PDB file of C-alpha atoms and ligand atoms in Angstrom:
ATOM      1  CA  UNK E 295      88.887  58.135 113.742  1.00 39.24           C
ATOM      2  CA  UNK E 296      87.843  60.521 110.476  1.00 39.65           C
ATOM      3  CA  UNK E 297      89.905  62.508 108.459  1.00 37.97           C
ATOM      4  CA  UNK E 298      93.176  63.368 108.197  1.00 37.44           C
ATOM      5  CA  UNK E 299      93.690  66.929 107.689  1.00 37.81           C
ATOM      6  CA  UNK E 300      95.970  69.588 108.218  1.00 37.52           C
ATOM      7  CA  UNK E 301      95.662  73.777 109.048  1.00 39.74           C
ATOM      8  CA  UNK E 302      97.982  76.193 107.979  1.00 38.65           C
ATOM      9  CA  UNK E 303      98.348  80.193 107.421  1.00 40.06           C
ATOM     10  CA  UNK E 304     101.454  81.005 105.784  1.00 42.02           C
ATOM     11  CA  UNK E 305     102.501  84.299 104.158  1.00 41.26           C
ATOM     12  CA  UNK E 306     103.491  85.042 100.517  1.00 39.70           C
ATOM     13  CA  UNK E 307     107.444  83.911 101.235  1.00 36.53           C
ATOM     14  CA  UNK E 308     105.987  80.949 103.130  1.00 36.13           C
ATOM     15  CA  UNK E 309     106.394  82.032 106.124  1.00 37.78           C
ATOM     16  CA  UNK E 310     104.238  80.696 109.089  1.00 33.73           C
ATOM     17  CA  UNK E 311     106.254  81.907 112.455  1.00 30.15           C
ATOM     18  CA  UNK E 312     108.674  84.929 113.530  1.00 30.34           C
ATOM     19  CA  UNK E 313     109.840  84.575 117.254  1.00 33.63           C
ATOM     20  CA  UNK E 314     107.420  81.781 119.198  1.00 32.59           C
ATOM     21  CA  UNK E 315     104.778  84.381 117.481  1.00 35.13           C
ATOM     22  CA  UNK E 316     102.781  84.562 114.215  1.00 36.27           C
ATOM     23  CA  UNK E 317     104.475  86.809 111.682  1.00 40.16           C
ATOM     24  CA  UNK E 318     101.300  89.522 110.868  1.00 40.25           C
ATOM     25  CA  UNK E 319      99.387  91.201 113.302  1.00 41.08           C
ATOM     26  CA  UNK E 320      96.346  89.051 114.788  1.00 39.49           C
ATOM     27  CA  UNK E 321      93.557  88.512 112.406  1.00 37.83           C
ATOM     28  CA  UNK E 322      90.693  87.751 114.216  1.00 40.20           C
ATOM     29  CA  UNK E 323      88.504  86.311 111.474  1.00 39.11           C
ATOM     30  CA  UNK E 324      91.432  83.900 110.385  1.00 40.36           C
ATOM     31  CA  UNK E 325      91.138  82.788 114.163  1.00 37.60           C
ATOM     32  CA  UNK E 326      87.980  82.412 114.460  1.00 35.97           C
ATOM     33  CA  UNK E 327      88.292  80.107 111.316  1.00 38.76           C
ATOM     34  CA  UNK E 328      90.934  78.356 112.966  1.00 38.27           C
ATOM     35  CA  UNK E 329      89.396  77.763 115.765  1.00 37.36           C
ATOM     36  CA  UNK E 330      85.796  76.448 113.983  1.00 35.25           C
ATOM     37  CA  UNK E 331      87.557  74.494 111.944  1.00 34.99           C
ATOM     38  CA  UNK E 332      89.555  72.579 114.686  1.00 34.46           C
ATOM     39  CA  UNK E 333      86.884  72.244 117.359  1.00 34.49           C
ATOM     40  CA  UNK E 334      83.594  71.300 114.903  1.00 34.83           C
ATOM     41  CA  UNK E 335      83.125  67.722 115.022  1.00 34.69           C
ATOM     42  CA  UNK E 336      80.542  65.802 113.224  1.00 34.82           C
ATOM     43  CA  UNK E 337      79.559  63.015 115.285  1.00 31.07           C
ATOM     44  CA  UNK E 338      77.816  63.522 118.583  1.00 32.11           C
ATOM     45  CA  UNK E 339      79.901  62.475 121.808  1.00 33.71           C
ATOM     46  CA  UNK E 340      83.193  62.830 120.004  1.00 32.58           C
ATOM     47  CA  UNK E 341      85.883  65.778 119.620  1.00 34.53           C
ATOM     48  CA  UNK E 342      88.477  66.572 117.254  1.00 35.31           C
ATOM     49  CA  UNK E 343      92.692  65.712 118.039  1.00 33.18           C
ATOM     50  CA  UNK E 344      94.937  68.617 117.414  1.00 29.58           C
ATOM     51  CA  UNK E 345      98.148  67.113 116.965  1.00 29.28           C
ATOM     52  CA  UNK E 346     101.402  69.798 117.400  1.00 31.70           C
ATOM     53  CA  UNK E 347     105.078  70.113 117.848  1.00 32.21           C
ATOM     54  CA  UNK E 348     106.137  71.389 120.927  1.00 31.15           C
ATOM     55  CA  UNK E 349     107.190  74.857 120.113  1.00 33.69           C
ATOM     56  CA  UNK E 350     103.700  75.166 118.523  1.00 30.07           C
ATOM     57  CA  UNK E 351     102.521  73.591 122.339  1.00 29.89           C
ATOM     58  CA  UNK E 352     104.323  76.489 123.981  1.00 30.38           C
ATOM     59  CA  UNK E 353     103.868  79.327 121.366  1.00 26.48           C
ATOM     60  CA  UNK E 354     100.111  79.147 122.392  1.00 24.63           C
ATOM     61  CA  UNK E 355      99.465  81.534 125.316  1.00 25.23           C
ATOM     62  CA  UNK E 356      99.352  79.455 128.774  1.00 26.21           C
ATOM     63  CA  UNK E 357      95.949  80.522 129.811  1.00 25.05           C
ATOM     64  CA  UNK E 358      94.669  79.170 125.910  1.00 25.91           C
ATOM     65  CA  UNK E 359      96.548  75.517 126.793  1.00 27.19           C
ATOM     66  CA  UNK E 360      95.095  73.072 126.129  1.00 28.45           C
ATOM     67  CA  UNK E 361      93.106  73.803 122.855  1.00 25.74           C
ATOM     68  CA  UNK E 362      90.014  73.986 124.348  1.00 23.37           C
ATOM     69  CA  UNK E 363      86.949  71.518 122.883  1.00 23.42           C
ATOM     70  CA  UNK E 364      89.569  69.184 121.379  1.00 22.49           C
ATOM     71  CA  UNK E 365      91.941  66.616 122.566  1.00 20.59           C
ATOM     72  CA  UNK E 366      95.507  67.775 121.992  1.00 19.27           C
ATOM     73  CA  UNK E 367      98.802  65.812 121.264  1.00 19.20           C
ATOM     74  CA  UNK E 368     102.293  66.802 121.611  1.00 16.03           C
ATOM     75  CA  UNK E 369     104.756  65.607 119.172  1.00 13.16           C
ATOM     76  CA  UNK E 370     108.973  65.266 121.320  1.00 13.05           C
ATOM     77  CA  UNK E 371     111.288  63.186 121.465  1.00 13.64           C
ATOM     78  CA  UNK E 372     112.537  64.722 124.530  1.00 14.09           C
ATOM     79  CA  UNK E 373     109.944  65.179 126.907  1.00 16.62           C
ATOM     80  CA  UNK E 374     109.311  62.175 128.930  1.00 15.92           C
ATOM     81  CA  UNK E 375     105.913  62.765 129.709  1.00 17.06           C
ATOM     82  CA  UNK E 376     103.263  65.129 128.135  1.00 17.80           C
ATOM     83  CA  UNK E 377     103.465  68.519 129.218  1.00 21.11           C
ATOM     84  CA  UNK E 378     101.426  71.053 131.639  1.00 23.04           C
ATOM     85  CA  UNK E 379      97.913  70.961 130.683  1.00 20.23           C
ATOM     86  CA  UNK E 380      98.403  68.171 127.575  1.00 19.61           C
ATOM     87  CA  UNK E 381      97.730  64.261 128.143  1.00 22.38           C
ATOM     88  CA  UNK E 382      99.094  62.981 125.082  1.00 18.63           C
ATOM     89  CA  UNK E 383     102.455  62.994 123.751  1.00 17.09           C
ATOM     90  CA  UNK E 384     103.781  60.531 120.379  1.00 18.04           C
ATOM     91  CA  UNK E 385     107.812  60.716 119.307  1.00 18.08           C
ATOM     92  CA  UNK E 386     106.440  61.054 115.977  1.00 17.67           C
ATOM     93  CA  UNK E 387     103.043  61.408 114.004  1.00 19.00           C
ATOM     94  CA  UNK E 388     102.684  58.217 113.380  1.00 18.42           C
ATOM     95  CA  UNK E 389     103.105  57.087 116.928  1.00 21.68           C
ATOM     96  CA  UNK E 390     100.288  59.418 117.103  1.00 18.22           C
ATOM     97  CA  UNK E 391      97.825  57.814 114.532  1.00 18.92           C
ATOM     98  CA  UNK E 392      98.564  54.515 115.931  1.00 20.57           C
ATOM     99  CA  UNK E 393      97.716  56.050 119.168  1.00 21.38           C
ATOM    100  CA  UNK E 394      94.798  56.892 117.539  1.00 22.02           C
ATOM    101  CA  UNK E 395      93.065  53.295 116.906  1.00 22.16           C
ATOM    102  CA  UNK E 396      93.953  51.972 121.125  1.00 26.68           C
ATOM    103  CA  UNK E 397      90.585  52.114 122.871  1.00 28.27           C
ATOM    104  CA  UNK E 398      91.458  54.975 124.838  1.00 28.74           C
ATOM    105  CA  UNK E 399      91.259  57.140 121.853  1.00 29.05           C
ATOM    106  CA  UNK E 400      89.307  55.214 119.149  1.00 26.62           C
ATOM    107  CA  UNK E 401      86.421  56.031 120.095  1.00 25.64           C
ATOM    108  CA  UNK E 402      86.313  59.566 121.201  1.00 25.71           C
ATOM    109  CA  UNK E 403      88.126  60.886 118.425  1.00 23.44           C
ATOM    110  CA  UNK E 404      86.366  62.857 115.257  1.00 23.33           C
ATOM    111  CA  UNK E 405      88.357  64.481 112.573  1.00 24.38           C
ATOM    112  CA  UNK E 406      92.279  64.216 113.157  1.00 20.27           C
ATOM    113  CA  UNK E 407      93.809  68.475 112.440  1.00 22.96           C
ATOM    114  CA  UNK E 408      97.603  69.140 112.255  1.00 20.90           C
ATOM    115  CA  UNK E 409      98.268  72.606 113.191  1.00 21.60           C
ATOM    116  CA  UNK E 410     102.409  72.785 113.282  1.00 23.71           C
ATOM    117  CA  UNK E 411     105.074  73.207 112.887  1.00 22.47           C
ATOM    118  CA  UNK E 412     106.968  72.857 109.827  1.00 25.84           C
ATOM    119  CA  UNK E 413     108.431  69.496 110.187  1.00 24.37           C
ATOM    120  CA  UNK E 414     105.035  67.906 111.794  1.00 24.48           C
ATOM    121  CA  UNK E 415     102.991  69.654 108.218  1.00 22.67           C
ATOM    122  CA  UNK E 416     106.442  67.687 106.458  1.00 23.77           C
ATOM    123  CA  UNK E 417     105.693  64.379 107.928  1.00 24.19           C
ATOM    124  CA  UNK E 418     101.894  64.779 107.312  1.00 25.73           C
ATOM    125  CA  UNK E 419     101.895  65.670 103.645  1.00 27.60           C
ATOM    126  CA  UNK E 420     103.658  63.004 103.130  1.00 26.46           C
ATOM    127  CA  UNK E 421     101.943  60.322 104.570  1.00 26.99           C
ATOM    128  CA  UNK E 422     100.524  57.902 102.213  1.00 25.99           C
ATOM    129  CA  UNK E 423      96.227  58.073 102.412  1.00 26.17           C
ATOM    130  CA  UNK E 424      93.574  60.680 102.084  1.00 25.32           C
ATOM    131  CA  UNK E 425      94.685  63.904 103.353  1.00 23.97           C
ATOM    132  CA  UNK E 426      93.420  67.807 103.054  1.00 24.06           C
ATOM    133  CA  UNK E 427      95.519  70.788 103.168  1.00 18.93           C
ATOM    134  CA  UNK E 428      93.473  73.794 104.413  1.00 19.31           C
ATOM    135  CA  UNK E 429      95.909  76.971 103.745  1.00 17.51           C
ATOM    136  CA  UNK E 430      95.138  80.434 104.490  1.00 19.28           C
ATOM    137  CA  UNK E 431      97.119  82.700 101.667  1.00 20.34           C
ATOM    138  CA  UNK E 432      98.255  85.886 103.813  1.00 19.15           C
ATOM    139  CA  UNK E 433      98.425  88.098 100.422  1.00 14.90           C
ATOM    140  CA  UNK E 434     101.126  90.062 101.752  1.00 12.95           C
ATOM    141  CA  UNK E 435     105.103  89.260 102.810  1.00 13.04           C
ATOM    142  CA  UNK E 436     106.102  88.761 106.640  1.00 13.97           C
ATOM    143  CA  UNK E 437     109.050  88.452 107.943  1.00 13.37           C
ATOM    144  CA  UNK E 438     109.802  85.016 109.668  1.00 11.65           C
ATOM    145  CA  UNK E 439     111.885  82.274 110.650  1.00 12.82           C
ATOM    146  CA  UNK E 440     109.299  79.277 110.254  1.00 10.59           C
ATOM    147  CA  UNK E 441     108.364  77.852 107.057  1.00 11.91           C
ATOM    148  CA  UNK E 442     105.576  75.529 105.426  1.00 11.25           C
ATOM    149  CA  UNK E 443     106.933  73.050 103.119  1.00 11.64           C
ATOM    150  CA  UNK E 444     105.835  73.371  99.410  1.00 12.91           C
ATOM    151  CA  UNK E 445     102.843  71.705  98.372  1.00 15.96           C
ATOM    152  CA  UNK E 446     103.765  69.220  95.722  1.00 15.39           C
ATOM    153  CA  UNK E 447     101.291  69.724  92.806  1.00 11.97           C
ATOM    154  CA  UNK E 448     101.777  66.332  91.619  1.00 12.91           C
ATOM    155  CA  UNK E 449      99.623  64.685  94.447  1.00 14.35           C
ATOM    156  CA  UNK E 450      97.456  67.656  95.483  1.00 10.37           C
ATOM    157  CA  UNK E 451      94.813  68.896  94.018  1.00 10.64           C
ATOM    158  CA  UNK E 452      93.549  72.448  94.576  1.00 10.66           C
ATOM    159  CA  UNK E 453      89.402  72.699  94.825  1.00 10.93           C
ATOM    160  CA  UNK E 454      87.535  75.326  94.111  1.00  8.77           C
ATOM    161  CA  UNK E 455      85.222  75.484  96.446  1.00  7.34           C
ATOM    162  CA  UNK E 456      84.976  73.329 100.075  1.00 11.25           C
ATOM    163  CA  UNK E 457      82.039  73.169 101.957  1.00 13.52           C
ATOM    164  CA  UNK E 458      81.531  76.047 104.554  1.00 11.83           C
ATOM    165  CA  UNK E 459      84.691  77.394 103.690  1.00 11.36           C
ATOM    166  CA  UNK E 460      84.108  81.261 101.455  1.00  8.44           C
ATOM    167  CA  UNK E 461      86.427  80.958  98.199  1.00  6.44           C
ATOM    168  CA  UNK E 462      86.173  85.185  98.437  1.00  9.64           C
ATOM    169  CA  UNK E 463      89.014  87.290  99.376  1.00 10.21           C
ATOM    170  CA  UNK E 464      89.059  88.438 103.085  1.00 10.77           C
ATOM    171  CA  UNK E 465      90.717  92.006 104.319  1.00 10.69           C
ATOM    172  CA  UNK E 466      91.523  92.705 108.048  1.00 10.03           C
ATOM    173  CA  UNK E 467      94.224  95.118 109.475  1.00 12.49           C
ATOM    174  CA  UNK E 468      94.585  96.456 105.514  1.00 12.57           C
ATOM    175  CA  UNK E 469      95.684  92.791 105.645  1.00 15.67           C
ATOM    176  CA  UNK E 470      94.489  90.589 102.481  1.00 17.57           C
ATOM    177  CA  UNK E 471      93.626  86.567 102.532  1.00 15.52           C
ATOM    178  CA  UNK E 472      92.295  83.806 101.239  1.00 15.48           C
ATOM    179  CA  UNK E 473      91.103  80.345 102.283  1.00 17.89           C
ATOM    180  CA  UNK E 474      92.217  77.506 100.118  1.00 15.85           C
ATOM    181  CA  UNK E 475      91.578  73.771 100.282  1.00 15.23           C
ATOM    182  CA  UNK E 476      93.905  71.341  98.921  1.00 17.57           C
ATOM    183  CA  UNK E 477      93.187  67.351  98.362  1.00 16.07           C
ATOM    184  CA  UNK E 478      94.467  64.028  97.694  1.00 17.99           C
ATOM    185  CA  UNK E 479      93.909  60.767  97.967  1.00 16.89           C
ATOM    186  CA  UNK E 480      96.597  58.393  96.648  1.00 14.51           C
TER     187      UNK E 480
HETATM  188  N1  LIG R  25     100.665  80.233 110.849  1.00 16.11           N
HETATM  189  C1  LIG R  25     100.359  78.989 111.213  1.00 16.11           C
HETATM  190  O1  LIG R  25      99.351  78.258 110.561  1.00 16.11           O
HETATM  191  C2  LIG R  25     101.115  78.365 112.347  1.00 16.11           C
HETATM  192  C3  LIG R  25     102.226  79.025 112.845  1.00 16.11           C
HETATM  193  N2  LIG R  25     103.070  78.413 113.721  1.00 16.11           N
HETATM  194  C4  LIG R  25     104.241  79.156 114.213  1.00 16.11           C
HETATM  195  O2  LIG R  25     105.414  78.410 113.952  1.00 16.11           O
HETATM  196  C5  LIG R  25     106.284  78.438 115.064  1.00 16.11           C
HETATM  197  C6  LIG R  25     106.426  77.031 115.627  1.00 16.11           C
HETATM  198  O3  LIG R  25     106.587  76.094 114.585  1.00 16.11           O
HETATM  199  P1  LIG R  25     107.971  75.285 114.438  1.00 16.11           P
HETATM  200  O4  LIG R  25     109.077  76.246 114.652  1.00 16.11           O
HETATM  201  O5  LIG R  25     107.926  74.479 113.197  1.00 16.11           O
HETATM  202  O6  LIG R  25     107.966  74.271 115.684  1.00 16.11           O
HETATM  203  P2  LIG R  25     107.150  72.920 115.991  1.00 16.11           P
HETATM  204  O7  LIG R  25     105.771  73.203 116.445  1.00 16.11           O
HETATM  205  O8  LIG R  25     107.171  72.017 114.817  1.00 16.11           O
HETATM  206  O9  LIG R  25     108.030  72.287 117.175  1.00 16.11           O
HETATM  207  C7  LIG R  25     109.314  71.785 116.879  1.00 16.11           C
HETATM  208  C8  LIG R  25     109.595  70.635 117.832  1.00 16.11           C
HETATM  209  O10 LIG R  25     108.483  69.764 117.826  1.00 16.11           O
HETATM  210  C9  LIG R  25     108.901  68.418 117.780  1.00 16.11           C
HETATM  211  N3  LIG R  25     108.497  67.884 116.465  1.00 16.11           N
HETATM  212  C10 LIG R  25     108.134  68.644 115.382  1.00 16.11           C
HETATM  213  N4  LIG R  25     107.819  67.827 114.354  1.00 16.11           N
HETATM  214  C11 LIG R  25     107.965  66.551 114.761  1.00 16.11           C
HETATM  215  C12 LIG R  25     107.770  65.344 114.104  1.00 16.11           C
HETATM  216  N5  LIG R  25     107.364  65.332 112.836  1.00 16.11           N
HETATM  217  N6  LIG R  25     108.000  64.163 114.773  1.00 16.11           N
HETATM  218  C13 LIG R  25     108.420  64.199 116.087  1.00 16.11           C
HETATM  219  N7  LIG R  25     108.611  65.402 116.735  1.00 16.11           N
HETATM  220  C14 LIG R  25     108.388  66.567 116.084  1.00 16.11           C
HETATM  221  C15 LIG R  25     110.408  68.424 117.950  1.00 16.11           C
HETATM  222  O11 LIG R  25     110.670  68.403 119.331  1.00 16.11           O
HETATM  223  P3  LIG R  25     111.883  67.593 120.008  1.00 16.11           P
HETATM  224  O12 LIG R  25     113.129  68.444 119.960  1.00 16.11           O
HETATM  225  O13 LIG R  25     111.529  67.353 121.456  1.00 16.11           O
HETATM  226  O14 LIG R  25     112.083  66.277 119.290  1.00 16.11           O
HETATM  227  C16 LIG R  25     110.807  69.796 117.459  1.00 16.11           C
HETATM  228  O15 LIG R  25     111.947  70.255 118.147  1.00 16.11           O
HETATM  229  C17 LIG R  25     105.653  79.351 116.100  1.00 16.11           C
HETATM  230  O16 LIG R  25     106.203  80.642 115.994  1.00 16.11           O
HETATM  231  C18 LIG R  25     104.193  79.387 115.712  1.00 16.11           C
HETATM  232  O17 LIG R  25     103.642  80.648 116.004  1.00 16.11           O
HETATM  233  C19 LIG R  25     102.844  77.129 114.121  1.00 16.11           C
HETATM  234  C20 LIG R  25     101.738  76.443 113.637  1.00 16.11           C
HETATM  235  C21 LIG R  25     100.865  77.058 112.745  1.00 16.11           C
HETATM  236  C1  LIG R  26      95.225  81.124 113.786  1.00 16.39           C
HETATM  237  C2  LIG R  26      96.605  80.666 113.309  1.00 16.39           C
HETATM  238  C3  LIG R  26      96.451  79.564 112.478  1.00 16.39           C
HETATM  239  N1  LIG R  26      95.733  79.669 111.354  1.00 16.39           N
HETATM  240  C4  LIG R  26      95.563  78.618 110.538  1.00 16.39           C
HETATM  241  N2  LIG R  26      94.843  78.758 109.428  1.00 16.39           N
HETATM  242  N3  LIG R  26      96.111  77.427 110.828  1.00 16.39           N
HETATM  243  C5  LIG R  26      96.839  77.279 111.943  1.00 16.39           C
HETATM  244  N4  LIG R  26      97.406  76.125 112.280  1.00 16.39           N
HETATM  245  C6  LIG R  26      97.028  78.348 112.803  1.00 16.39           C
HETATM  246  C7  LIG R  26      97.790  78.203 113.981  1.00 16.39           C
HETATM  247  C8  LIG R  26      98.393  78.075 114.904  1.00 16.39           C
HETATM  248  C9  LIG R  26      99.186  77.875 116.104  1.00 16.39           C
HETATM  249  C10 LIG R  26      98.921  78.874 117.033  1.00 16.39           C
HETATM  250  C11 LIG R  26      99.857  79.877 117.244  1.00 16.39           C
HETATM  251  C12 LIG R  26      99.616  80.885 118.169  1.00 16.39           C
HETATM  252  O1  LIG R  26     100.554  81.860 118.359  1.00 16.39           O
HETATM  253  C13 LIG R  26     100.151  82.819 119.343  1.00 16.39           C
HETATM  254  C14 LIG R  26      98.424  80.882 118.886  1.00 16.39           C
HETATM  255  C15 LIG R  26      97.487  79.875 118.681  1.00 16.39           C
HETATM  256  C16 LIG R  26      96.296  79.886 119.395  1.00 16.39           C
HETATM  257  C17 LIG R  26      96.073  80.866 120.356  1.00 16.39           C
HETATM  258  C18 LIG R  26      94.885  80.880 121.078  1.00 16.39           C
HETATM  259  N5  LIG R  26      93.914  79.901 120.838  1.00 16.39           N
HETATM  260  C19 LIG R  26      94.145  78.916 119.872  1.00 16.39           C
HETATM  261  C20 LIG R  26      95.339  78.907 119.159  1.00 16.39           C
HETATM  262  C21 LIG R  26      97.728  78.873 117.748  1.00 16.39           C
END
């Protein structure tokens, strides 16, 4: 088990979800991040956990379930067993980092990636260890009814640069962005 990080885009009034849906248009570049991101391990014969909540489970088209590449987790407390298409489910993240370190996932696991919702990105920020933040700034409002928690600037750092990630501005759809990696360590 590697790193503990997790993956965000969130509009300029924090937004992050509007209706089971994202709030902008799709970006196909901020996908394709996304999806590199996520899926790239960096040991041979492993692959990366996605952890999510369950609306983030079922806000994924059916035919894109599970995250394919990566071994995916469901976070409820009221499903019994993991859902349609997942094999893991944990009543909470830790539950799920525990689940980490038992030999059916020790060693077959890379880089652990949290990728929603609100109260899952909550939980993970603050838990105590080294964790990164990567957040995609959607330079632009949206309206929505999901919201990532506020990055307290007391623990996080903000770096300039990260490896393979461009510090530039990006433009799609007349839609501006940027890719931002925060840090800390405890
Ligand atoms: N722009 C972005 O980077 C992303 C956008 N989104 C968007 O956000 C919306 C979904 O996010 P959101 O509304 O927050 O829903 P979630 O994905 O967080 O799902 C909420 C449910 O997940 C379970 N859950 C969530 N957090 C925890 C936790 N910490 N511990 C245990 N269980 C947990 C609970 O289920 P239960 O009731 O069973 O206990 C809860 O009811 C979608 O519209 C999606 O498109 C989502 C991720 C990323
Ligand atoms: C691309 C956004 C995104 N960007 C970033 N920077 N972090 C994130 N955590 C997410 C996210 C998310 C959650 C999410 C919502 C979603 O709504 C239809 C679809 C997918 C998805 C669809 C098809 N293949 C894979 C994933 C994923």
């Amino acid at each position: 088990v590697g790193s503990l990080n997790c993956i965000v885009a969130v509009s300029q009034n924090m937004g992050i979800g509007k209706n089971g849906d994202l709030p902008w248009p799709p970006l196909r570049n901020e996908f394709r991040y996304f999806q590199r991101m996520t899926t790239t391990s960096s040991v041979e014969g492993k692959q990366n956990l996605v952890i999510m909540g369950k609306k983030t489970w079922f806000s994924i088209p059916e035919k894109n379930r599970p995250l394919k590449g990566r071994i995916n987790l469901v976070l409820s407390r009221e499903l019994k067993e993991p859902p349609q298409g997942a094999h893991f489910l944990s009543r909470s993240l830790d539950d799920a980092l525990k689940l980490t370190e038992q030999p059916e996932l020790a060693n077959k696991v890379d880089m652990v990636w949290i990728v929603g919702g609100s109260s899952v990105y909550k939980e993970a920020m603050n838990h105590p260890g080294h964790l990164k933040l990567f957040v995609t700034r959607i330079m632009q409002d949206f309206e929505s009814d999901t919201f990532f928690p506020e990055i307290d600037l007391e623990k996080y750092k903000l770096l300039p640069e990260y490896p393979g990630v461009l510090s530039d501005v990006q433009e799609e759809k007349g839609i501006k962005y940027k890719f931002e990696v925060y840090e800390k360590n405890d």
